[PDB]
Write a protein that binds this DNA or RNA. Structure first.
Lengths: 11, 213, 160, 53, 53, 53
RNA sequence: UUUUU
RNA sequence: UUUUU
RNA sequence: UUUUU
RNA sequence: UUUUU
RNA sequence: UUUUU
């Protein structure tokens, strides 16, 4: 189950 | 009695026998396949999750949406239980990319969630939160007591009745307002007037008929 | 074109033929969906969509029976109206045209579904009209000689 | 002159992604399905819905 | 241009601590969950909630 | 009837059997574990009280 | 007659 | 159809 | 979801 | 009719 | 469109 980032890329 | 147009038959009888749309795929309550497809690709695009790892996240999301509600006012983060700890995925892409609404997207998960409630009631008493809020005293209808159930023709009439009673108890005559303040805030026109050193007041050029008598 | 009409009839069996229908309607080609636009259908229906689709009435009626030969097929509209019968699903669609050669129990079911569906709809006739301008034109001439933008020249001011 | 072509362009853009035109975002139309009609220069034809009117 | 990045920055700061931006404190927004949208230069996109609009 | 996307199955059946979220930890009425964790550390930080006490 | 999505 | 957190 | 002092 | 940035 | 310190 992957942890997630807040301002992660591809945006 | 078959419809005519210019003396010609409007319908094809031959295709009418061989048409089996299975009653769910042509419903309005369930979003179209292209819209759910675009939603599923867009939420994967905003999570940076591989295609192998994405169904797990959907298994988590389905359960979370069983417990809580799939309203379009959903905000914050949704929780998936990894072992003993929690992971907090952002809700923004899910309600962001759901094109008709979140209800018609999540209605694809309807029978799988229905069987998931039964699988959880095999082990322990598992009534979903939405049924606890709607105060359904039955407990055996907890299989049908979730927010996004898509009423198929192959459901019990007592389950139809329970779902419609929960929906009507839930809406409570919601006056669906269409507009809210609009962004054109400026109601007063521009003061295009020129100011001058010669002027008497800021709002007044030159007293002109004052007679001082 | 008749194929497309066969698809449209079924879609209108499941959903409703209201004049507020928008979006796209779905036909099942094999396993995939095709999404025809709803705009021309409600656009060109001259009395309403109900009186157009009432040509498809008995064919849709027999289509429900043909689908109930194989599997339990109740149309969506009957699922929304919560008809507990199931054998009257042959009559439980939105655009059924009540002929003299129908059962009286089917008359009763259709009229109960219609009366349950309308719920005293106050048919309003007008909505805001496009003549938005309620204030007349300010035809007045502005002048360099003028005192204020809204005032030519104080004339009886006595300064006492 | 560009009225119905723009009207169908909003529908073509709403096929892919949620595309409400800016003017509807300024007018704060909560519907979303009427974004096909929520632009500045729409020419109201007789063949439009009364809810769109 | 900094609109959605600032929007996600408010959410990243609300992960840790209660972080409402000053502009929302001046506008006296009692919600707190809409602090993600309560800044001066937010660019209203079609993919925003109607309650945030 | 299991959901499809581009002919591919959207769900993982295998994880679906082994998922036991115990119905409370994924509720909205109960705050998340990180938020209660930050609350419990912050109220201890503002009281000057040891972890035993 | 219209109003049943 | 939307409105059920 | 918030609103229960 | 014009006035909707 | 500008006007939100």
């Amino acid at each position: 189950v992957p942890r997630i980032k807040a301002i992660t890329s591809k945006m | 009695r078959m419809p005519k147009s210019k003396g010609a038959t409007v319908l094809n009888l031959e295709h009418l026998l061989e048409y089996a749309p299975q009653q769910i795929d042509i419903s309005n309550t369930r979003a179209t396949q292209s819209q759910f497809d675009t939603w599923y690709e867009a939420v994967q695009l905003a999570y940076d999750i591989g295609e192998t790892e994405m169904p797990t996240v959907m298994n988590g999301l389905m359960v979370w949406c069983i417990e809580n509600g799939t309203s379009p006012n959903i905000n914050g983060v949704w929780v998936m239980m990894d072992g003993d700890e929690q992971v907090e995925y952002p809700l923004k892409p899910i309600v962001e990319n759901a094109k008709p609404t979140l209800r018609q997207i999540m209605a694809h998960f309807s029978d799988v969630a229905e069987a998931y409630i039964e699988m959880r009631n095999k082990k322990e008493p598992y009534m979903p939160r939405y049924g606890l809020v709607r105060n359904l005293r039955d407990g055996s209808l907890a299989r049908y007591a979730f927010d996004f159930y898509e009423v198929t023709s192959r459901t019990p009439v007592r389950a139809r009745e329970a779902h419609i009673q929960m929906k009507a108890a839930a809406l409570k005559s919601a006056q669906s307002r269409l507009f809210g303040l609009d962004g054109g805030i400026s109601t007063q026109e521009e003061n295009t007037e020129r100011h001058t050193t010669e002027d008497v007041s800021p709002s007044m050029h030159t007293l002109l008929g004052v007679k001082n008598m």
